[PDB]
Structures are given as C-alpha cells and as structure tokens.
Design a protein around this ligand. Structure first.
Ligand SMILES: Nc1nc2c(ncn2[C@@H]2O[C@H](COP(=O)(O)OP(=O)(O)OP(=O)(O)O)[C@@H](O)[C@H]2O)c(=O)[nH]1
Ligand SMILES: [Mg+2]
Lengths: 142, 10, 570, 198, 18, 415, 180
C-alpha cells in the first residue's frame, strides 16, 4: 500500500497531497519538505527510487511537476511506477491534455479521481475506463 | 513557463 | 545570435557598435558566457565615446582571467589611454589596468602606474594609489621592484585629503599582507599630519585615517592625551563605522593613558553616549554594535554600567539582535538592576521562539548564579515558569533549578517539595537527568524520593548513559541516606546496571557502587554522600591576552565572532 | 463567495511570502466571517478556499465544524466538499472525527451509489481505532452485496478495518468465502488483496 | 498650509548673547 | 574589505555583480542561497554568512539582498556602511528599489558601481556629487570630490535663498504589561532642505543646555540632548570646542543633526486596554485612549493599533471617537482617529467571536503601538535660536523650520 | 437605506428561529425530533454523532439539531453552541440513576457564558410509564427555578403518543418571537 502521495512541482511547490497514514500536521509538513529536498537534490539517473525512512520513495515526474510515493518494503518497485503512470493517463483522459495549470485550478477533480482510483493506499480499480466512467457518472450527478 | 506542457503528451 | 553580434561589433557604424556592446554587457549580466567573443570586442576598444569604453573595460576585466592570452592585445590601448587629458579617462584606465588579473600584463603596467603616481589630478592620484595596492596584492615583488613604497609614503604628506586617505589605506593594505619587515610606521609628526587632514576627509576617508592609528602605540601620556582629544570629535559622526572606529581608537589609546588624570574619566563619560547612539542603528549593524559592546564590556565594564534600559529587546528586533540583547543584559546584569533584568526575562519567557525562550532561560540562570542577592527571585521566577505548563519552559526551569542547586543548595530545600510533583513525565534528557540529580542530592525534604525513582527505573537499562548514571547515583545516595525504604531499590539498581547493563562506564560505576556497598556501607556515607567543594562557575570573560588583541581588531570579522584574526581567515 | 479559480489566481499573483500570507489571511477572514453566519449556499466555495489555504501551508483549525456540518447535509456538492475536508484536514488525532461516525452511518445506508461510496472511501482513508469498532457491522453488510462498483469499496474498507483493528478479522472470514469467481477485474483484485491481508 | 506644523522663520544668531 | 559586491534577488538569481579584488570566485554566490535557506530554517540566519573561508555579509533590501563577499578579516562595519551608501545612491538615482530597475539601468548601474569603490575601498558616496559625473541620460570629475568640501557643489545659484528645516520628533515609549514604561527615549531629527546660492556656511544655534550653561543662561528651558550626531558638513572640532555648530549646508534635503536624549515625562497618549477574552466563546477589548499632551496640540492621524486574535471573526467595535477597522492581513484592530485634540479621551469596546476548536500553536501577544502625530508640538522643548547664513557674495537668506511631533517606538506591552 | 423589501417579506412571514436537541441518550430526543418533523415513532440506532433537521410550523423554520447523550459525545455539545439561538433539554424521568447525570450535564451546559440568550426548554420525555414524574417534581429536582436569567419551561411530551408537542412548540415560538 502507498503510505502517501505528493505531487510537487519542480520549484518545490506541491500541487497535490494524499497521505494514507495519520501523522501530525507539523510532522507531515516536515516529511513533505524533506521529500521535496531529497527529490529536488537528486539527479536524473538515480533510478527513481529512494529508501527514505525505510520507505521505497519512488519519484517519476513526466513534466515540470514531479510525483512522489511511499510504498512499504513488501511489494515490487515497478508496481508503484505502473500505478503512477496509470493514474497520470487516467487524469489526462478525464481532463484532456492535462497540464500544470489545470492541476492547481482543478485540484478538487484530481483529488476526487485519486479517491475513486486508490483508497487507503491500495488500488481500487485495475482498469482505466471503468474508473473514468464512474468519475464521469459521479460528476454528472450534480 | 513549463507548466502548460502536457504531463505525458498523448 | 553570436555571429550577428560579432558582425555588428565588427562594423564601422558607432550606432551598431554601441548596441552590440550593450547586448554583450546585458548577456554577461543575464548569465551568458560571452568570453568566446573577447577577441572580437578587442578591435572595438579604442573608441572616442566614453560610454562604450567603460563597457569594453568592464568586459575585459571580467574576461581577463578566462582568456589571459587574448588580453595581450590591450597593453597598447591601456598605455595610450593612460595619457588622456581627461582625468576620468585616465582614472578609468588606471582602474582597469589594476583590475586585470594577468601575470604578463601587470609587468608592463608599472610605467603607467609610475606616471600616474605623481599625477596632479586628485582623482588620478587616488586611482594610481588604488592601482599600486592592487598590483602589490597581485605581485608584491613587482611592486617592491617598481619602488612604489616610496611614492605611496610621500602621498600621505601631500595635499588632496581624499588622495592622502586613499594612499594611507593602500599602504595599510600592503603592510597588512607584509611580514612586518620595513613597516610604514611614522613618528608623532606623521600622526599629527594625519589628524590635521582627518577633519577634512570624507566619510570613507575617515575610516582610512583612523585605521592607521590603530597600529601605532603611544609611549607618553601627553601624546596619548592629544590623540584622545583629537579623536573625541569623531564620536559625533553620522557614519556608524566612523563612530565605531573612533571608539576602537580611543580604547586602544586608553591602554597607555593614566587613570589618575581626568582624561580617562572624560573619555569614559564621552564614550557611553556614543554606544547609546550606536545601539539605535540599523538592524544589520545592531549585531556588530552588540559584538563591539560585548568585546569592550569585558575590558572596561565601568563605562556602560548604568546603561541597562537601552539593552531591552524590542518587539520588532531581529533574532540576531534579540539573542545579543540577552547576552548584553547578562553581562551588564547587577544587583542595581536585578529587578529590571528579572522583569525583562519574565516577559521574554512568554514569547513563541523556542530558541529565544531557551536563551532567556539561560540568561536568567546566569544572572541568578552570578548574583546571589537575587537567588530567591530567580528561584521564584523558575517556579512560576515551571507552573506555566510549558514543555520547553519546564525543561529550561528544571535545568536552571538543577544548576542553581549545585551552586546554592544551602537554602534550596524550600523548592524540592514544589519540584517533587512538577510533571516528571517529560522525556528531555537535559531535564530528566537534572531532576534525578536534584532528587538524589536533595533526598531529604521529599518523603517519596524512593517512590519517585521507581517510575524512572522502569527503563533505566535503555534510557541513556548519562540518565542511567544519574539514576544510579541518585539510588546510591538514597540508599546511603535512607537504607530502610531503599534497601531493595539499591539491590535492584545494582542488578540492572551490573548484569543487564553493557555500558563500560556505567558498568564500572555500578561495580564500584556494589563493591563500596558490600565492603563498608558506613564508609559510603563519607565517600559517596560527602560534602563536595564549591563548584567553579564557568567564567564568560575572555582571556586578557585575547582581549588586548581583540581591542585593536574592532569592527572587523575577528570582533563579531570573538575569535582571533588568524583563527578564521584562510 | 469568491470562486476557487479566483482564489487560485489571487494566490498565484502573490510573489513575496509576506504578500502571499497577507492575501491568505485576508481570504481566511472572509471565510471565517461567512462560516460564523452559518452560510449554506456558498459553503462549497468557502470549503474549497479553506482546503486550498490549508494545502498551501495555512492553518485550517477553525474550518472543522463546517466540514462536519456539510457532511450531514443533503446537497451532492456540499457532501463531496465535506468528505474531501474530512479526508484532508481530518485524522485520527484530530479528535473531531468522533461525531463523524453518525454521519458515516447515516450515509452508509444511503440509496445513492456516490454518497455511500464517498463515505466508504473517507472511512477507509481516515479510519480510526474507534470508528471501525462502531462501523464494522455496516462494512460487512456492504461486503456481501452484489454491487460490482461497491464490492471493491467494501473490500477496501474491510482491509482498512483489519489493518486498524487486527482483532476484527474474525468477522470477515464468513463474508469473503466464495468470492474468487468475480468477473470484474477490480472485484477480483480487491478480493485477492483482502485475502493476502488476512 | 502643511501637515505636521506650519513652517516658522528662524533667527540668525543669539542676539542676546552678543 | 569587500571582495565582490553583488545584488541578489528573491529567487537567488544575482541581478548584478561587480568584483573589486577578485580574491573570491564568482561561483560562491550560488551557495549563498542554500546557506541562507538553511540558516533561516534553523534560526541561525544572520546578515553575515560564511561559505567556508569566504564570508557573505550583506543586508536585506526591498526586493534583493546586497550580499558582498569577502575572504580576509575585512571590516564588517565598513562593509555595512558601503552597502548603506550604495542603497542610498540607488534610491537617489532610482525612485524604486526593485528588480524593475536592476535589469533596466545596468548601463548606469555598472558605471556607478565601478566609480563608487575601487579595490574594495569606497571613495565617492555623495549622490549629488556623483550625479555630476555619472548620468544615465562624460565630462571631467567635479572639483568637489577632489576638494575638501565634498558635500556642497560650488557655483550653485538660485533665484531665492530659502532653507526649510524640519524638527521631527520621535516619541518612543516601551510600556510593559504591568503598566509602567521601561524604555522612554525621544530622538530628535533636524532635517533641513537648504536651497541657497553659492556655498553658505550655516551657523546653527539652538537653546542647548550645555551652551546655556557655558554662556551662563542655564536657567531657562534648554534641551538636554544626551547624544548629538552631526552630519558630515558639521565641523566636529567646532562643536567640540565651544558647542559651535558651523557647517556648509548641502544642496537639497539632508540630515544635519540627530539628537537623542531620554524622556522622563508622562507619555503623550495613554492607552488603558483590557482583554475580556472568553475561553473559545468571545473576546472584549475595553481600550481607552487618554491624551496627556497639551490641549493646544492636536494629534493628527492618530492610529492606536490593538492586536486582536488571529482567528477572530465577526468582530464588532463599539467606540466613541474615530473609525475602528479590523484588518485580517495584520491581525489587529486599527483604532484610527483623524483629529485627536489634546486632553481628549476615546473609549472603545471591542467584541469578536472565536472558533470552538482551539488553535494548534500559540500566536504570542504583539505589543500595541500607537501612530500619534501631533504637529507644532516639541516634546523635548528644544527651540532653534539662530541660523548664521554667511556668504562671501552677501545675500539676505530666508531660513524656515517646522516642528513635527510623532510617535516612534511607542509600543505598549500586552497582558 | 430602504427597508421596503424587509417589510414586504415580514408581511407574510420572515422569521425562522432556531432550536437545539440535547439530553441523555435513550431520552426520546431522536423520537421526539422524528415526531416533530414527520409525525411517526421511528426506531433508530443510538446517535453516535448528531442529527440535524428542520421543522416548519407557524411560519417559523424550527431547525432541530439532535445531540446524543453518549459519554464521548457529551463534551461535544460546545460545537453546536456557536451560532445557536435556542436550546431544548430532554429529561429522562424513567432513569432514576441517570437523572442525576442528566441534571449535572444540563448544569454544565448552562454554566457557559457563550450560551446566554438560549432560553431553557425542558421536555418531559418518555411520558408513557407510571414511573414518570409530573411537570413540577422533575423541575423541582433539577432546580429549574434557580437558573437566574434563564427562561425555562417544563412540558410533558409522550414519544409514543405525541401529546404536548404542539404546546411546547407554541411556548418556544412565544419565547422566541415577541410580536403579534
Ligand atoms: N416505547 C417507548 N420508548 C421510548 C419512549 N420515549 C423514549 N423511549 C426510549 O428512548 C429511545 C429514543 O431513542 P432515539 O429516538 O433513537 O434518539 P435518542 O432519544 O436521542 O436516543 P439516543 O440515540 O441513544 O441518543 C428509544 O430507544 C426508546 O427506548 C416512549 O414513549 N415509548
Ligand atoms: Mg438520537
């Protein structure tokens, strides 16, 4: 299960945050700052995997805004990257040419999509079209 | 800018 | 881009050459490596317009070390420009010649420097004096061979007070890097001549004029009295550095002055208003002023004895100034303003800065330790802070109480009952250990000392080495004092620290305690529970040798850090 | 009631940290003024602004009762905003999620598949040691249903309850039996995850 | 007029002190 | 002894750099930003940094930090003075101190930086004198820089000879929460805008206590200035000899003298504020302002800032005189009064709500600061006696001066 | 300014008012609220959190915020004390041992300086068993007459029957609205 997911920009600003572990607000902020510093202080050939606090911190940013995850040391490492890619593809399909500008303004939509896709740190829908259809149906409810 | 670019460009 | 810029710069039109020069200057400022086009801009250097000449000179200076080989095509231009009738052009050429860090270029620049050394224009004279110092810093041997020391020395004894100050500063810089051999010191006549031009020098020239006297050492009271009288007017200067330099000069000269005469008293009285005025400077200079006051406080603490209200930290004061305010108050703390210091510390304990709160607690503890007349007030303030229900404040109060008990524990039995139940659940190693030590040493006014130590013995094997040692010492002291209610506690502590304790020092201490208990429990009272001698407090005053050297280094990097000049430079 | 896009643009227009903090405080003052009046029309915009301010690094403690009030509301947008606020600014150590158990129980039996799903997702994301104790009975009821879209949510809620309460796994053994024949990939994945966790 | 107090003319020296 | 004077920005980018000695590599500026960030996040941030063997001492400007790298044991005070002089020169040349002029005035900025300091030793710092040799829209340098008088350009001619003075008072009061005032000092400020023809030698004369005692008139109202800081034009020797303030006024507005003496009188404005803050229910602000100043003086634009709760919402103000507004940006109640006659008494009754949920961290108790400004009122009682304007040509000057009384560090500690 | 729109709105009814639902658990608070809103005795699980509803009667929207009597929810009544104008206390006359606890909770809730304008509203719930007291014995035991600056009114309402709810609503409307 993913302990936490933090979508941070290249400049260090965070556009998304979703932690599945109940932590203090100050502790959560410190952890986010440390993760941003570690990711921002890493090269492009670091394997996209960091063992921070005994957590397989996987970073894979496909644009200026980066992505982060906190997977426990009990599952495969490529699974987190595959899940991140699937989530990015689903968000792009739901939004349509998703960019950094739409993420900040449409943070509620991204949060709803993440909730409908991953709940409690585990995957909820393996397919990419069923989740999109469910999100569209929920949005069309009003 | 660098923000208007698509995350995956699909 | 690059090709277009080169074509524009290699044209015969001045309107395009100026635009190309401006674009090249902007690219360098924007962070563009334009050193590849240095040879192209060399051709468009000898221009009549002064606007493009300055840009070319700046580019050459900034692109001189990068391409030293390509800089050989500018010696002739510099030589030609060093004889222009306009003083501004000559000054710019002199500044650019000394700014180029080229080993093969400064050798041929000696002739222009010698020619401009005796220039009639004061700006040209200042530029030559600056270039001589720059060349000496770049190449001391070349400067010595050129014989610029004699020309520099004669500069101070000539007209043009700004040029004289510049020459004095250049000579001081050269002697600063020099090995003290063939020093540029002068007799009293030179000092009098410099003082005569001190009142006519500019704001920047005042520092140069007063720095020279920082190296000279007066030998007679009359000379020292005259120097003090001449430096007294400098205390009313609008420049913050001028006032600090004058104060440093007065402090240095006071080492030879006689306290029997009235000159020392007048100097002391005229220096406090200067410190008060400097204390109201900018926040950036506030730290420097505080460091200077601390450095001079340990040498002449009788000047700012009555200056206590101005040391109060303001609400909008910076952290670097707020921290220094507490140190200044502690250094100037006395029984006269003990109540004011306690009130200021009490107000400083209600802030939100954890570092500020810790600094205030440390200052209060230092004031309580230094002055025994306010020990009761300090104890009451610490008790109030502990009752304030603040974790950091509680730890600070516990540390202060532990420090005070070791120093003044004769009448500290009235606070043990209050500290017996004072939220002992805090896990701070600096507070739990202090509480354990206080309980062990003060296990007479608390009837539940054994019960209190029971809670701290649950994890004694994994709490900490210092904490475990303090707990073992407290248990041993309790067993020695009251072995009826702690007979089993001592055995349990020995078993836990001797069998399940892998710490080398802790294991040795436990073995020694067990051996003492099993050999002679009666002798343990006179061996373990003995009357320790007076604890020597850590004096904050600097060593007299360092203080004397720090006196001459006032307003520099060695004064703010309170470190020797050779212990921080590289 | 300022819109979320307007607030985002205003925040982006601030350059200095002090200016951004001043703008955030100015927006929070209006948000608190609206909340103190018991506003229910533009409550979604205020909740979104408060969530954006909290994510940017500003305090949001005062916006705790508003999220609880919006959770027990009837509007779909208000319910979604309340669920998002509970998921983001609400945790086990918050101490204000105890009253949310009644709202979750009321929304757990809702006929709508979106409100119940949102409540289940919020319970799974912010499961507490006491919420699962009073919500274990309702979780098992939804796990035995034939809803493909709700089967995965029920499995996730059961897994979260088991992780938070290891002693509650005995009540899930008779509910997950004979559940490996689900045609949907999501239901099968949820069942496999639950079996692995057990 | 001017905020902060109207400007007043100043003397040349202490006429009473010679 | 600065090695390279550079100007940074809010994003860590160096807007402009100008090395003076070359002993410090230009790449050390990149580590200044991470060092400053680390110092700020740990509470050890200071104006003077240290990157190994190189110290980065600089001040914080409006939008950029003028960090001046150094390697040797250079004078920190000298570096600070040079930075202040550079900031003043930039303010005189450019009305705004931001990134808008750094990237647009590089042609003149580079020339000013080169002319200001050479080899780390500044030589020219007068904005008026420097404006005659370095302009953004070149002749030989003026003789004023070479001459002793570097603060008054010769040959200045005007149709009239009018000098406007400004005796601005700064009433700073440090009142503790117990109701007593700890730091109560008044700092004078004699700022004059000299506009005359030629190079007159002004002879400032005031009713100083020392001067009155020396002359034998130490019995009338005399200002007891504990510290007097004259300008560069003021002759220190003349003041030290017989309290003679003789100096050549500059062309424009400048600070001649800055008196600073303690005040033992009652505060002009007395604020009696109470805090009936309920435990997460409501709050009351029974703030009463008492004017102890003379009734003939009016405190125009009186603004007594009352720090209200940070999370307070739905506030109500029940005052008597003056508009009361709460600014959420500052988190305080601004008791703004347009006209405050001396001896007046304004009573206010604040009432604001509070959220039921308690705050996660403490916010502190900022002191209450008043913004009273009563013109034509000199608290110190210092009055200008004479101004000897002497010119070789001979002209009839028309000196003028006004007395303005305002509030400086007049903060009141809260309970 | 003009208040023509306000007068037009008030000509047909504009005031709504508020109300609170607090008391011990199993005191008929949820059943009383259901009867006031719907008019039927609905059986519900114990109120772990809270229930919010509204009642439209006499042109006034009497919003009822049910609050449980659980130990973990007893100190949570301060959350609804903000922006609250009314308060209704549900007594449990069928629980002799819980009567003291209910009285203590009512005294604790009535000892707050924030809740001062909320008039007392004592409802005699569970008025169907012979062990239930009258409208004066319960008030005398609770000391409702000793609440200074508190307008309290004791009304007996039967959860199964619904009698007395109209009288309580009329009393609440008269206490809240002071017009014709
Ligand atoms: N049969 C019967 N039961 C009643 C009557 N009045 C009160 N009760 C009891 O009171 C309880 C009412 O509970 P709810 O209506 O669900 O709401 P509540 O009063 O707030 O109780 P909690 O939810 O536990 O806080 C019922 O369970 C009944 O047992 C009544 O007139 N007849
Ligand atoms: Mg109920």
């Amino acid at each position: 299960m993913i302990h936490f997911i933090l979508l941070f920009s290249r400049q260090g600003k965070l556009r998304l945050q979703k932690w599945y572990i109940t932590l203090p607000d100050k502790e959560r902020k410190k952890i986010t700052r440390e993760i941003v510093q570690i990711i921002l202080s890493r090269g492009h050939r670091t394997s996209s995997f960091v063992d921070w606090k005994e957590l397989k911190l996987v970073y894979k940013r496909y644009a200026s805004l980066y992505f982060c995850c906190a997977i426990e040391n009990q599952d495969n490492e490529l699974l987190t990257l595959e899940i991140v890619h699937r989530y990015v593809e689903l968000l792009d399909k739901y939004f349509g040419n998703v960019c950094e500008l739409d993420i900040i303004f449409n943070f509620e939509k991204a949060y709803f999509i993440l909730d409908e896709f991953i709940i409690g740190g585990e995957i909820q829908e393996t397919s990419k079209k069923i989740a999109v259809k469910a999100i569209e149906d929920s949005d069309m409810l009003q | 800018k660098g923000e208007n670019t698509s995350l995956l460009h699909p | 881009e690059i090709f277009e810029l080169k074509a524009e710069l290699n044209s015969d039109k001045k309107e395009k050459k100026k635009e190309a020069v401006k674009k090249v200057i902007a690219s360098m400022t924007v962070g563009k490596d334009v050193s590849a086009l240095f040879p192209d801009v060399v051709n468009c250097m000898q221009t009549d317009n002064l606007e493009l000449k300055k840009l070319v000179y700046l580019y050459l200076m900034n692109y001189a070390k990068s391409q030293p080989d390509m800089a050989i095509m500018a010696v002739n231009t510099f030589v030609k420009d060093c004889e222009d009738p306009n003083p501004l052009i000559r000054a710019l050429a002199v500044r650019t010649m000394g700014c180029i860090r080229v080993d093969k270029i400064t050798e041929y620049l000696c002739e222009p420097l010698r020619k401009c050394l005796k220039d009639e224009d004061p700006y040209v004279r200042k530029t030559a004096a600056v270039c001589v110092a720059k060349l000496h810093d770049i190449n001391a041997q070349l400067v010595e061979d050129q014989g610029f020391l004699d020309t520099l020395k004669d500069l101070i004894s000539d007209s043009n007070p700004m040029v004289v100050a510049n020459a004095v500063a250049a000579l001081s810089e050269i002697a600063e890097s020099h090995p003290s051999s063939n020093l540029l010191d002068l007799n009293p006549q030179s000092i009098n001549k410099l003082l005569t031009a001190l009142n006519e020098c500019t704001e920047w020239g005042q520092i140069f004029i007063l720095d020279c006297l920082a190296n000279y050492m007066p030998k007679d009271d009359r000379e020292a009295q005259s120097i003090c009288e001449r430096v007294t007017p400098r205390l009313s200067h609008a420049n913050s550095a001028v006032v600090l330099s004058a104060v440093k000069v007065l402090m240095k000269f006071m080492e030879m002055l006689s306290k029997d005469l009235d000159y020392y008293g007048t100097l002391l009285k005229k220096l406090a208003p200067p410190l008060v005025t400097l204390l109201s400077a900018e926040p950036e200079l506030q730290y420097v002023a505080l460091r200077n006051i601390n450095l001079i406080v340990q040498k002449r603490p009788e000047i700012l004895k009555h200056e206590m209200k101005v040391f109060f930290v303001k609400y909008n004061d910076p952290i670097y100034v707020k921290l220094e305010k507490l140190d200044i108050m502690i250094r100037l703390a006395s029984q006269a303003n003990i109540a004011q210091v306690l009130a200021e510390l009490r107000e400083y304990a209600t802030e939100v800065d954890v570092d500020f709160v810790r600094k205030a607690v440390r200052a209060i503890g230092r004031c309580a330790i230094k002055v025994e007349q306010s020990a009761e007030r300090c104890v009451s303030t610490l008790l109030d802070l502990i009752q304030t229900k603040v974790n950091y404040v509680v730890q600070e109060a516990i540390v202060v109480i532990k420090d005070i008990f070791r120093k003044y524990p004769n009448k500290y039995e009235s606070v043990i009952a209050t500290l017996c139940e004072n939220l002992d659940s805090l896990d701070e190693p600096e507070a739990r250990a202090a509480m354990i030590w206080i309980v062990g040493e003060y296990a007479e006014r608390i009837d539940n000392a054994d019960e209190l130590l029971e809670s701290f013995l649950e994890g004694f094997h994994d709490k900490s080495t210092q904490v475990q040692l303090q707990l073992l010492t407290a248990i041993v002291k309790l067993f020695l004092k009251k072995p009826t209610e702690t007979q089993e506690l001592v055995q349990q502590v020995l078993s836990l620290a001797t069998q399940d304790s892998d710490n080398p020092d802790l294991r040795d201490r436990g073995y020694i305690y067990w051996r003492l208990l099993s050999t002679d429990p009666v002798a343990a009272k006179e061996v373990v529970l003995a009357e320790k001698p007076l604890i020597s407090e850590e004096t904050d005053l600097i060593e007299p040798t360092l203080l004397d050297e720090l006196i001459c280094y006032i307003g520099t990097l060695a004064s703010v850090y309170h470190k020797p000049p050779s212990a921080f430079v590289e | 009631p300022i819109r979320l896009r307007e607030l985002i643009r205003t925040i982006r227009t601030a350059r200095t940290q002090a200016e951004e903090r001043e703008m955030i405080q100015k927006e929070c003052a209006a948000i608190r003024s609206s909340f103190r009046e018991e506003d229910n029309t533009y409550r979604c915009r205020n909740v979104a602004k408060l969530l954006y301010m909290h994510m940017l690094g500003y305090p949001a403690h005062f916006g705790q009762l508003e999220c609880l009030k919006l959770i027990a509301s009837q509007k779909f947008t208000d319910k979604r905003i309340g669920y998002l606020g509970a998921m983001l600014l609400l945790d086990e150590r918050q101490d204000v999620h105890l009253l949310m158990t009644n709202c979750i129980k009321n929304d757990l039996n809702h006929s709508t598949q979106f409100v119940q799903g949102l409540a289940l997702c919020t319970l799974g994301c912010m499961g507490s040691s006491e919420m699962c104790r009073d919500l274990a009975g309702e979780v098992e009821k939804l796990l035995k249903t034939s809803n493909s879209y709700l089967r995965k949510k029920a499995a996730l809620c059961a897994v979260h309850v088991i992780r938070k309460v290891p002693e509650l796994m005995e009540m899930f053994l008779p509910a997950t039996k004979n559940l490996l024949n689900e045609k949907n990939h999501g239901v099968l994945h949820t069942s496999v995850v639950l079996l692995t966790e057990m | 007029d001017r905020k902060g107090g109207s400007y007043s003319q100043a003397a040349g020296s202490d006429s009473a002190q010679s | 002894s600065a090695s390279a004077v550079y100007v940074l920005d809010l994003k860590g980018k160096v807007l402009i750099c100008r090395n003076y000695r070359g002993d410090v590599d230009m790449s050390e500026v990149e580590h200044f930003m991470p060092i400053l960030m680390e110092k700020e996040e740990e509470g050890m941030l200071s104006p003077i940094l240290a990157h190994g063997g190189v110290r980065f001492m600089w001040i914080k400007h409006n939008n950029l930090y003028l960090v001046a790298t150094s390697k040797k044991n250079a004078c920190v005070s000298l570096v600070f003075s040079f930075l202040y002089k550079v900031v003043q020169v930039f303010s005189e040349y450019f009305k705004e101190l931001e990134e808008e002029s750094i990237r647009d005035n590089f042609v003149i900025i580079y020339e000013l930086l080169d002319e200001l300091m050479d080899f780390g030793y500044p030589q020219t710092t007068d904005s008026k004198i420097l404006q005659e040799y370095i302009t953004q829209e070149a002749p030989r340098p003026p003789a004023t820089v070479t001459n002793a008088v570097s603060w008054r350009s010769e040959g200045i001619k005007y149709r009239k000879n009018e000098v406007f003075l400004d005796v601005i008072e700064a009433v700073n009061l440090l009142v503790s929460a117990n109701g007593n005032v700890l730091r109560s000092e008044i700092v004078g400020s004699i700022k004059m805008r000299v506009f005359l023809s030629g190079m007159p030698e002004l002879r400032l004369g005031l009713n100083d206590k020392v001067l009155f005692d020396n002359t034998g008139r130490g019995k009338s109202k005399s200002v007891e200035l504990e510290d007097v800081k004259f300008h560069q034009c003021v002759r220190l020797s003349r003041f030290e000899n017989d309290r003679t303030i003789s100096f050549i006024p500059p062309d424009g507005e400048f600070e001649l003298m800055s008196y600073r003496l303690n005040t033992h009188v009652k505060p002009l404005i007395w604020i009696e504020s109470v805090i009936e803050k309920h435990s997460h229910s409501r709050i009351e602000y029974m703030v009463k302002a008492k004017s102890q100043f003379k009734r003939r003086s009016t405190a125009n634009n009186v603004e007594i800032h009352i720090p209200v709760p940070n999370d307070a919402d739905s506030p109500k103000f029940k005052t008597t005189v003056g508009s009361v507004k709460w600014v959420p940006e500052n988190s305080e109640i601004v008791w703004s009064v347009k006209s405050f006659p001396g001896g007046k008494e304004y009573l206010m009754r604040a009432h604001f709500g509070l959220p039921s949920v308690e705050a996660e961290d403490k916010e502190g108790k900022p002191p209450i600061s008043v913004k009273f400004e009563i013109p034509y009122f000199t608290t110190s009682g210092i009055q200008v006696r004479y101004l000897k304007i002497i010119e070789k040509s001979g002209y009839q000057a028309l000196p003028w001066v006004r007395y303005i009384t305002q509030n400086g560090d007049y903060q009141l500690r809260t309970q | 300014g003009n208040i023509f729109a306000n007068l037009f709105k008030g000509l047909f009814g504009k005031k709504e008012m508020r109300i609170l639902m607090v008391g011990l658990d199993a005191a008929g608070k949820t059943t009383i609220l259901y009867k006031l809103k719907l008019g039927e005795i609905v059986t519900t699980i114990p109120t772990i959190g809270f229930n919010v509803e509204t009642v439209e009667y006499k042109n006034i929207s009497f919003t009822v915020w049910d609050v449980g009597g659980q130990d973990k929810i007893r100190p949570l009544w301060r959350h609804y004390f903000q922006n609250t104008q009314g308060l209704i206390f549900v007594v449990d006359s069928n629980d002799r041992e819980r009567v003291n606890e209910a009285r203590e909770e009512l005294m604790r809730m009535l000892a707050e300086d924030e809740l001062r304008d909320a008039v007392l509203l004592v409802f005699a719930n569970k008025q169907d068993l012979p062990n239930a007291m009258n409208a004066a014995e319960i008030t005398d035991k609770l000391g409702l007459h000793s609440l200074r600056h508190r307008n309290w009114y004791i009304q007996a309402t039967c959860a199964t029957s619904g009698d007395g709810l109209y009288e309580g609503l009329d009393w609440l409307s008269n206490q809240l609205r002071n017009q014709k």
